[PDB]
Design an enzyme around this catalytic site. Structure first.
Site, PDB file in Angstrom:
ATOM      1  N   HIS A 130       0.807  -1.212   0.000  1.00 18.63           N
ATOM      2  CA  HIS A 130       0.000   0.000   0.000  1.00 18.63           C
ATOM      3  C   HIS A 130       0.850   1.277   0.000  1.00 18.63           C
ATOM      4  O   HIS A 130       0.369   2.343  -0.381  1.00 18.63           O
ATOM      5  CB  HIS A 130      -0.985  -0.001   1.177  1.00 18.63           C
ATOM      6  CG  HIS A 130      -0.357   0.320   2.497  1.00 18.63           C
ATOM      7  ND1 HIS A 130       0.214  -0.639   3.305  1.00 18.63           N
ATOM      8  CD2 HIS A 130      -0.218   1.497   3.153  1.00 18.63           C
ATOM      9  CE1 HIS A 130       0.682  -0.066   4.399  1.00 18.63           C
ATOM     10  NE2 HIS A 130       0.433   1.229   4.333  1.00 18.63           N
ATOM     11  N   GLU A 131       2.110   1.161   0.413  1.00 17.47           N
ATOM     12  CA  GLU A 131       3.007   2.317   0.477  1.00 17.47           C
ATOM     13  C   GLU A 131       4.040   2.343  -0.647  1.00 17.47           C
ATOM     14  O   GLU A 131       4.936   3.187  -0.645  1.00 17.47           O
ATOM     15  CB  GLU A 131       3.730   2.372   1.823  1.00 17.47           C
ATOM     16  CG  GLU A 131       3.091   3.289   2.852  1.00 17.47           C
ATOM     17  CD  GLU A 131       4.031   3.616   4.002  1.00 17.47           C
ATOM     18  OE1 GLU A 131       5.193   3.157   3.970  1.00 17.47           O
ATOM     19  OE2 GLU A 131       3.610   4.335   4.935  1.00 17.47           O
TER      20      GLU A 131
END
Ligand SMILES: *[C@@H]1O[C@H](CO)[C@@H](O)[C@H](O)[C@H]1NC(C)=O
Length: 209
Positions: free
Chosen positions: A162-163
């Protein structure tokens, strides 16, 4: 006698390690300086937790930090655990780990995707985890030999799915799902999407003239 050179022509220093895939198995390859040696990698066993044995998702973020293997962080009884999603806050599921095997595959840098070597020595200090030290950027990096001061071989530590990040050709950083757009008279137009796939991957659409 010297540094290793893979079949693909990639080059690893003596004492470096990387991951190769033979059939359905993951291998850990080491440069002997006399040749190479690859050994099957162990899969960290997961048990219990609110996932009930769901396999780890590495790396993952917890408490605004990124973890590349199971941790005892936040545990009073020193159990090892790992979230089962890249983001343990948004989602909030985890499970317990039996072992603490640590394999951190780098990207970019001058180490051709070698694993982080722990501990590595920088500014006369031994780091047992990736760091941002010396970086105005705040990107996490690891030494790919046991001594960075001497060897100076580094890589960039992974980021939770997600990052993840995609960097533009000019250098700007985009996150997953973000779209990069370039306009050249409409005669030529190109839009790119930051997919990442661990490799800072772009998927793009263009038209011609
Ligand atoms: C760093 O680790 C290496 C491992 O060989 C050791 O020789 C050295 O003494 C360590 N340095 C520090 C700062 O503890």
């Amino acid at each position: 006698y010297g540094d290793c050179v893979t079949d693909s022509g990639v080059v690893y220093s003596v004492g470096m390690q990387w991951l190769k895939t033979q059939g359905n198995k993951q291998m850990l390859c080491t440069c002997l300086g006399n040749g190479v040696s690859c050994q099957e990698t162990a899969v960290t066993q997961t048990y219990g937790g609110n996932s009930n044995g769901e396999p780890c998702v590495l790396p993952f973020t917890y408490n605004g930090r990124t973890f590349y293997s199971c941790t005892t962080e936040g545990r009073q009884d020193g159990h090892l655990w790992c979230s089962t999603t890249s983001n343990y806050e948004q989602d909030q599921k985890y499970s317990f780990c039996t072992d603490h095997t640590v394999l951190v595959q780098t990207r970019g840098g001058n180490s051709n995707g070698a694993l982080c070597h722990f501990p590595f020595l920088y500014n006369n200090h031994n780091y047992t985890d990736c760091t941002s030290e010396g970086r105005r950027d705040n990107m996490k990096w690891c030494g790919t030999t046991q001594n960075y001061d001497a060897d100076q071989k580094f890589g960039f530590c992974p980021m939770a799915a997600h990052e993840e990040i995609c960097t533009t050709n000019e250098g700007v950083m985009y996150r997953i799902g973000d779209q990069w757009d370039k306009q050249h008279d409409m005669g030529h137009m190109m839009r790119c999407t930051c997919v990442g796939n661990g490799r800072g991957e772009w998927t793009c659409i263009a038209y011609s003239q």
